[PDB]
Amino acid sequence: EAPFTLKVNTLPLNFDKAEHHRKFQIHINVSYIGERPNSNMVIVDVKMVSGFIPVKPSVKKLQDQSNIQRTEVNTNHVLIYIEKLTNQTMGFSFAVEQDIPVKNLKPAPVKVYDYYETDEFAIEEYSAPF
Amino acid sequence: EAPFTLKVNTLPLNFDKAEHHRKFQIHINVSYIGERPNSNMVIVDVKMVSGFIPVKPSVKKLQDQSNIQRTEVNTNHVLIYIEKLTNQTMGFSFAVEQDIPVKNLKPAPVKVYDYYETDEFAIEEYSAPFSSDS
Amino acid sequence: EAPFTLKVNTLPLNFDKAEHHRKFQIHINVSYIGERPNSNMVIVDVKMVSGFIPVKPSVKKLQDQSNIQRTEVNTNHVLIYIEKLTNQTMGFSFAVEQDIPVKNLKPAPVKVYDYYETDEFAIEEYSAPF
Amino acid sequence: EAPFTLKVNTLPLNFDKAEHHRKFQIHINVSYIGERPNSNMVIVDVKMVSGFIPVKPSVKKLQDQSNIQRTEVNTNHVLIYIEKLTNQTMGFSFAVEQDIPVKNLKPAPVKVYDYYETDEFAIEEYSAPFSSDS
Secondary structure, eight states, X not given: OOSEEEEXXXXXXXTTOSSSOOEEEXXXXXXXXXXXXXXXXXEEEEEOOTTEEEOHHHHHGGGGSTTEEEEXXXXXXXXXXXXXXXXXXXXXXXXXXXXXXXXXXXOEEEEEEESSOTTSEEEEEEOOOO | OOSEEEEEEEEESSTXXXXXXXXXXXXXXXXXXXXXXXXXXXXXXXXXXXXXXXXXXXXXXXXXXXXXXXXXXXXXXXXXXXXXXXXXXXXXXXXXXXXXXXXXXXOEEEEEEESSOTTSEEEEEEOOOOOBOO | OOSEEEEEEEEEESTTOXXXXXXXXXXXXXXXXXXXXXXXXEEEEEEOOTTEEEOHHHHHGGGGSTTEEEEEEEXXXXXXXXXXXXXXXXXXXXXXXXXXXXXXXXXXXEEEEESSOTTSEEEEEEOOOO | OOSEEEEEEXXXXXXXXXXXXXXXEEEEEEEEOSSSSSOSSEEXXXXXXXXXXXXXXXXXXXGGSTTXXXXXXXXXXXXXXXXXXXXXXXXXXXXXXXXXXXXXXXXXXXXXXXXXXXXXXXXXEEOOOXXXXX
């Protein structure tokens, strides 16, 4: 029903090690399936699972992709500015690491929406691989 | 209906403005409520939670108490040898500190049992005093 | 001449094995032979031989000793805080393991000094058992 | 004054941001400068350095060259059978990877010799391309 398709998956990283903090990759898969041939600039808003913060370098290297204008790291939110989306899938990802341990972890929301047409959006949830 | 009463509580010591490594206190409250007037020597087995090890000095100073014969620090386990337990509460504690980052936040078990009557025991759980999302 | 006696010796560990990294024990023998009956808090600063890093658990277990208040592991330096020293020898040790192989290894310095009287110190060198 | 010229160089392939196991290239540069117009079949014997084994595919692909009859991979040794050498330089290479952690950083020998005239040879050394303290 939504004009955007959004699939969020998580994959653990360095789980068998010791001196490292819990860390995982957040994979975002998105596309535009609305009436228009393509969307305008799109924003993917990823809220952090409690106690987890984004690994800055991995977030910033997303800007290297031509379809990703820029990235912002605010308080427990990662913003990804995407140039355009068509019905072709776009799959990108970034890592997050545990800053403060928190139990009974609840899922965090991910929102994708057209910057100029906010009524066009899709919301999905994801949870830490633990 | 265990022949022993066991209550385990944790008290965060510096979880807010700690310097390098945060630590907390494990309070053990136990008594014997079985059929005998008192127990024989009792062993309290405290398993450590992920990423935590006992602060040795605090464990050893438990031996200063008349009712505590000795203490043992094994791989992720603390053993406390108690001379005797009655239906009167015995409340002791020791500290544990973080050696490596947490790999989980699961609860660790605590077992209290009569050395000569192993069939008489009680098991309870506890976990690191981290803030909850709930 | 120095108010502190300092002797540093190294002993190889797990040298006949295979899947393990080169590893060795650093033995520190120290005492105070100055004018005072004893020193104040003393600091032993052990610099790492290139490519070698300290085996954390062995460094931390030094704190179990009553005469060792605490230990610090900084960048290629291990600091040991000793409560007091008299003319009686104090011999402790910890292990270090090869993180990155480096050839033509030069000796690394070890410094012992009174925290409040820095003019009172002794410096010695040690090298990897290879 | 060897009847063969032998130069061995190593090129680190991923010693900086490697994933699990780092590997490097061994470049062999050789020629025949003896009294004859050319040599007979020549054998280059490359001994491996501590903790390193040859990356088989790279060794085998050497056989694709017309001047290389075949290659052999023995216990910590790589043999390259060269059809012929003149005073013209022949420069080939192959990769080696780390199987077990280093037990030393000593240099390994490389020998080039005429199969039928073993008295005619040249020996040179090389070691893993690790950073130096000097």
